[PDB]
């Protein structure tokens with residue numbers, strides 16, 4: 001039987017690799033926020049707590065579950081079984097309410113801009129996170145650990161490990177409705193209002209200009225510099241014809257409006273000098289002109305102030321990773337209410353693992369797309 005043994009060795013290697021990636025990625029996120037004040041924002045406070053729950057899953061949950069499935073029974077004991085189940089459900093519930101905190105916090109940012117942002121401090125974020133973990137502990141830990149003493153009998157036999165009050169399939173489905181399906185519905189509606197709020201024009205032009213300027217600086221070939229030059233110039237002219245939030249609400253004849261347009265005119269002049277040199281065969285010189293563009297952009301930036309499009313995308317990525325990795329297990333619970341043989345044990349294990357995988361892919365949804373996280377990662381990994 002060489003194939004069965006190879007399956008066991010393959011599973012141990014894959015599970016150990018998944019656990020290790022989950023641990024390293026989330027420790028990198030947590031340490032980066034703690035050592036970089038530029039990363040110490042309210043958003044990253046929520047992401048810090050989310051990385052903390054993901055780290056616990058990678059350290060405790062994945063390894064204990066791998067030991068459970070590989071050995072074929074629970075080898076540690078009833079106490080360690082109860083602690084593992086309680087830790088798993090408390091951490092998972094804290095994750096769900098953490099995503100609800102991120103979704104509601106973003107909702108009040110886009111719907112109450114005159115009131116909520118001033119109430120959005122680090123102390124408020126810490127209290128919300130602390131309340132989420134305490135509520136999760138109170139909801140799940142006493143029932144999981146002490147239900148056997150409430151009914152006066154432990155029905156979990158030796159070598160088994162499962163939540164005792166989940167012996168009724170309808171109870172498990174009710175848990176799936178209250179703890180997974182309703183929160184997912186709330187976050188979906190909340191995100192729906194988020195993307196509808198983001199769906200004003202001035203930020204959409206200035207963000208395009210800065211983005212294409214970065215693309216010019218870090219371009220690999222001659223096509224990227226051309227496309228970014230043209231699209232930045234189009235966004236530059238659209239941002240030129242419009243009026244910024246100028247002070248004193250001055251007329252177009254004002255010295256503030258005239259010099260505002262003049263800065264964009266000089267910007268287009270350097271843009272066309274860069275485009276010319278790019279067509280002469282001096283594509284490297286067009287990149288040097290982008291630095292001069294950056295200089296001119298910094299010489300007349302006092303007239304302007306939005307990365308919030310990236311923030312909305314980041315939230316959607318975190319929400320989709322949660323929904324997609326946790327939905328299979330929860331539909332197995334739904335089918336389990338009326339057909340237990342319809343879900344084999346191997347399928348249950350896969351659904352359980354996909355939920356764990358949520359913690360593995362979580363850091364890649366926000367950390368691997370943020371310039372400050374990337375630079376802090378590089379600093380943490382470079383030899384001093």
Ligand SMILES: C[N+]1(C)[C@@H]2C[C@@H](OC(=O)[C@H](CO)c3ccccc3)C[C@H]1[C@@H]1O[C@@H]12
Pocket residue numbers: 061088089090092093096175176177179180326329330333352355356
């Ligand atoms: C560790 N898990 C893989 C176990 C199985 C799943 O359980 C759920 O999806 C239920 C809702 O059906 C759930 C329980 C608690 C908190 C959130 C969801 C995901 C998490 C949770 O701790 C359990």
